[PDB]
Symmetry: C3
Subunit: 257 residues, 3 copies
Amino acid sequence: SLIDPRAIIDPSARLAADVQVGPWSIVGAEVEIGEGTVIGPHVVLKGPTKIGKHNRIYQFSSVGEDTPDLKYKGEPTRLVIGDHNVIREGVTIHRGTVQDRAETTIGDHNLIMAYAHIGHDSVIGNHCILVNNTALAGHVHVDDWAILSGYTLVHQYCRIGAHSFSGMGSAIGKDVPAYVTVFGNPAEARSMNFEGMRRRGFSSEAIHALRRAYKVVYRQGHTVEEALAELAESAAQFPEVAVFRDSIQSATRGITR
Amino acid sequence: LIDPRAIIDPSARLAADVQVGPWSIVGAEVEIGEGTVIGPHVVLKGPTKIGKHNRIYQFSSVGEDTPDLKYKGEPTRLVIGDHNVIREGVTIHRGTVQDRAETTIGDHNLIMAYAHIGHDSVIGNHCILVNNTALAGHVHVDDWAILSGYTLVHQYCRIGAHSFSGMGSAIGKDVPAYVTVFGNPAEARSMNFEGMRRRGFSSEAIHALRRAYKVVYRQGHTVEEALAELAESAAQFPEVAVFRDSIQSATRGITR
Amino acid sequence: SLIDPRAIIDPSARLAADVQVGPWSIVGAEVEIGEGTVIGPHVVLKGPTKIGKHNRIYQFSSVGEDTPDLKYKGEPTRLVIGDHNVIREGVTIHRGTVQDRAETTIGDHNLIMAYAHIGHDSVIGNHCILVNNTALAGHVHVDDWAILSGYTLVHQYCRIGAHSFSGMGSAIGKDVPAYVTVFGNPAEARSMNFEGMRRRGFSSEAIHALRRAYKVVYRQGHTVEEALAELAESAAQFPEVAVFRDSIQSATRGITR
Ligand SMILES: O=C(/N=C\c1ccccc1)N[C@]1(C(=O)Nc2nnn[nH]2)CN(C(=O)c2cccc(C(F)(F)F)c2)c2ccccc21
Ligand SMILES: O=C(/N=C\c1ccccc1)N[C@]1(C(=O)Nc2nnn[nH]2)CN(C(=O)c2cccc(C(F)(F)F)c2)c2ccccc21
Ligand SMILES: O=C(/N=C\c1ccccc1)N[C@]1(C(=O)Nc2nnn[nH]2)CN(C(=O)c2cccc(C(F)(F)F)c2)c2ccccc21
């Protein structure tokens, strides 16, 4: 451990073994930091916030702030961050709202690049990448391995499916199904993230069942109900297709087309 | 109240109950008013006036020089009213001598993280600038206007009262009062009926304003023709006069 | 003195005797700063980094950090900045990767406005303007006098030609030839920077030949090869047309059309 004496550590904060806190950082009341986490210089941490192990948080980041969206803040709302996350320069992460989840949740092994915004009540899974200035407005669910390219904007309540991909400057207003590639403002479905399936070792059979799964949903004039029925068999054979099918079935307010 | 690790210039001026966080700079000729909380890690530069019950969050640079090459160090101003919330990393520049030598913000404005307010810009009251909104300079934002995340505005554009931009809009012409605009480049879509409900507009003044939108946008009229038919509706409803006056004062083109 | 006592200066740092450094700034290990350079408060400089003379770096800037690019594995890579550059509030500049030439390079007289990003292995020439929140992903070459308007996004390996211009919110995925004006997401070729050419004092004859050069590349159904061959003659007569022609010849991502 090195706790720099120019940092401010609230008496109610809890620091585990091997935690580093750089100069002029604030570890506010009710912030818990897990084993081996490195807080850079000029970082503002605010609670109630739970941060796990072996995280890295860069300078000028505001982690666990209140949403500005309310004037009168509800407390106590939480921020939970898991393990092995990188949070780059100037990132903003807001805690939840009493109305909704009362918690913003980030899992493990995520890369959140400079000036990205994680809005109130959002949930990030594991192994996600949010590129520079990605902004999640609030109540955004990002499932595992999803990649949002630089300056991707996401409206409230949108679901970003597992292994999905957004192009630079995408503006997402509807759910993105698992594996789907989206581009533009407003965002449009283009293809699937075949590159990602390969890099995570999907069988060719799985990749071909997912290609056919795309066409079923987007290209053959079927209701969502008819697509779910058509996808049932492929979904039962391939867990990878089931992830796709589940992402479409969970979309009650429709999907990015 | 003033944290001892903050830097207060001799020539600054702070009201009784002003709070200033650690590692913040209150530079030369900065006035701060009653009940204003300056966060930690804030750079204020002057000549700048800040009113009362304002909150400025960490990493904000309020009152710097414009990098606009037309600026050359003249002692231009920035003025900020009361009950404003300025969030993480906001940049606000002072005026230029070429145009009035003042940047102006009124009252009850919510300016979210990394928003930029360029030289000589004039913001009214009860405005929302969502994350990373950017006003290049000489942008006039009238009362109750809402600019959604990453809204970009070119110099000299007028954003009308009760107007709304969608996420990632790029505005290059005046937005009339109450008009909703979307995309890059921004195009007119509808009227902020929502925002009229929010101000307790009579259902008559709301029907008057729906008619007004159809006169301007949906009936192949010119602006001169559209301004002409509105004249009586604007005499009848002050709410319609607001809309009519925003179009009248828009001799660079309105957003279509 | 000119080094604020609240600044951190690494023992291995090399500062010219007149260098100014504001409070709570960090001048890291293996950072060199040349004559006349003013470092504002709250600035983080990481090395190995060379900064030249009469530069100005504003608050909340992170100059010389490691790229988050997963391909980078902590190797000793560098950042070189020249003279008379203005770096505004919250600018991020990353050092290089060994996969290229292990250097990020900025020339002279550049204006880099607030929250602009310069990614690993990028090369900026002289007299360039990067307006607020302009982002260069990596391996981006911006040649002399190019202007990138606010929130211009550039993909890796894209080349931005001399005296080129991008409109507000441009998303560039292909090379911008010298003198060309681009707008939109995705970016679209919309004429040449005649305003900028006229201002900088380009001759009438050079402009007229560039107008014709534009027609050959964009407006005659020619493929890049046909166009290069058809340009050969004017490229041999007018240096500006040679700069234009070379920028098409050197394009590795194709050209913005
Ligand atoms: O709320 C919003 N807009 C204006 C506002 C009003 C009062 C207070 C603050 C902002 N929310 C927005 C939203 O997605 N609302 C919604 N959709 N479904 N259910 N709720 C997201 N939004 C935005 O512009 C927005 C809001 C917060 C954060 C961000 C960002 F950029 F950081 F991600 C962006 C927008 C733009 C147009 C319409 C609706 C909304
Ligand atoms: O305004 C501009 N240049 C001077 C400048 C102003 C402020 C700071 C630095 C330079 N350029 C712009 C402009 O609106 N010029 C103009 N119109 N009418 N009269 N002048 C805006 N502009 C921009 O890209 C721009 C310039 C400054 C700030 C911002 C932002 F994002 F922070 F808001 C954006 C742009 C993009 C394309 C064409 C013209 C212009
Ligand atoms: O480049 C990318 N990923 C690696 C990386 C680089 C720098 C930092 C972190 C990761 N992805 C991108 C790329 O250009 N890849 C590529 N092209 N040629 N060879 N590779 C760019 N990219 C981006 O979204 C991107 C990546 C890093 C930084 C930035 C920004 F915004 F800061 F400028 C943007 C994107 C979006 C869609 C497709 C491909 C790519």
